Design a protein around this nucleic acid. Structure first.
Lengths: 274, 276
DNA sequence: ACTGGGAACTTCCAGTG
DNA sequence: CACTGGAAGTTCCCAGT
């Protein structure tokens, strides 16, 4: 097959989701390796054609089978909850740079679904029986629809492909994990130290404090009633896998999430005697 | 005959409950309502003791005292008012299942229209001085009482206003509590670092206050210190003392400058720096 | 069953490129 | 002044009794 390939996947974290009341554009979407300096945008590649036709982008649930989604895509060449333009005959390398996510309100859900049905907005034209399930309105996936030409001048339509799942930063249970301030950055190795920490949004339930050394796992101890307003954690430092020590040695302290396992920035922590 | 108040409503530590919540709102306390000696808000009327009807409505904090786009919900209440029937026996009366329920910025107009309709305006302020804006955290209580004159004809009395009532999602006007403190003994010289965790506070409206027998001390932090309005990182100030000898006791709290309010008071000790 | 309270959803907005 | 987080307003509900 002349086919469809995804190269710049999208930045799963680091983005928030905006409603009908928050500017009809919401900037654009970054690529997984975008970082302000070398700031890139999501792209695809086509192998076995370079010429005219059509490109479409729709929105599908994370977990399969992948239904259309009750959320909308807004900006350039965008309409009816997707993006439609005309493919560029120049190359077979493609970038989408004015791209938005609009989230729809949980009562407007059924309306949205109806609209999608009306459109035929469904890559994997699934039955309207299973299109009942339950919905994920944190997480969205990207699906690609393409029409080209055989060496006659018909239209020809290709295998539709999936992206890394894309997440909401205002959203609590899938927010990007950051550590903002701290109360110290070195106590004794013996463990007992109690530490005051200020962070981006975190939920008290699913959340630990995680330490890694040259092979070594420790967890530092606190109850869901030490978590003050979801942005503050108070804990006790687990002793070292070597109580005796003597020198100073330095490790890593992070925030994990037992369900998905996503890790914060790492901040440097040092261990002492007496 | 005139109407006087003996217990007030509790100025804060109460929350305002939308129509989508509507559990009542529990009830409203008096000002000196303990958890054990629970009271309610009570009024006494001096010069006549006999059959009666009494009405309470909602008027803006702001004078002129307008009608307020809010309601009172509970027993004997409807369209944002309470009307009942007095015990003619006593001149001592308290009201017990009482609620404040709040309305959604669009549905302001609707509420105001309803007030206009039901002649909720016990200071009959014209609609020219009903314009602009209102106050949404904060409402006042107005009492209108009807009696019998020396004949038996019906008579109405000059109606009175009470210490105002505030809502604790309203950042500039809730209670001011503390919750945890990593450290509560530190240097009197200054240059020692303390972490304090609290209910909601604005980041341009807040200080930190230290008091002895007549004395004010302030500890200084930039604004981008107050993290998400629950967390403060700030230095413990230089004390009234070049270098101590004994250790000395202060009271330490949270003060907000707009309205100069105070929080719980908690004990902090300074210990005589024989090294740095 | 009730409250107290705590987060989860939703809307605005000010500050800084 | 177009994004960007923070914060404020609204709804939901889970934990205490």
């Amino acid at each position: 097959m002349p086919y469809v390939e995804i190269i710049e996947q999208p930045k799963q974290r680091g983005m928030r989701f905006r409603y009908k009341c928050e500017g009809r554009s919401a900037g654009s979407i970054p690529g997984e390796r975008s970082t302000d300096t070398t700031k890139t945008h999501p792209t695809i590649k086509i192998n076995g054609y370079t010429g005219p036709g059509t490109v479409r982008i729709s929105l599908v649930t994370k977990d399969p089978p992948h239904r259309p989604h009750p959320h909308e895509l807004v900006g350039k060449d965008c309409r009816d909850g997707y993006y439609e333009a005309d493919l560029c005959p120049d190359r077979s390398i493609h970038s989408f740079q004015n791209l938005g996510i609009q989230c729809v309100k949980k009562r407007d859900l059924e309306q949205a679904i109806s609209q999608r049905i009306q459109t035929n907005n469904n890559p994997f034209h699934v039955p309207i029986e299973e299109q009942r399930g339950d919905y994920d309105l944190n997480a969205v996936r990207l699906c690609f629809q393409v029409t080209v030409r055989d060496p006659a001048g018909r239209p020809l339509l290709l295998t539709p492909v999936l992206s890394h799942p894309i997440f909401d930063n205002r959203a609590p249970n899938t927010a990007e994990l950051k550590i903002c301030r701290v109360n110290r950055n070195s106590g004794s190795c013996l463990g007992g130290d109690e530490i005051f920490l200020l962070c981006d949004k975190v939920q008290k339930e699913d959340i630990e404090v995680y330490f890694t050394g040259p092979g070594w796992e420790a967890r530092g101890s606190f109850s869901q009633a030490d978590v003050h307003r979801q942005v503050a954690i108070v804990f006790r430092t687990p002793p070292y896998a070597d109580p005796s020590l003597q020198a100073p040695v330095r490790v890593s302290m992070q925030l994990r999430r037992p369900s998905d396992r996503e890790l914060s920035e790492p901040m440097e922590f040092q261990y002492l005697p007496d």
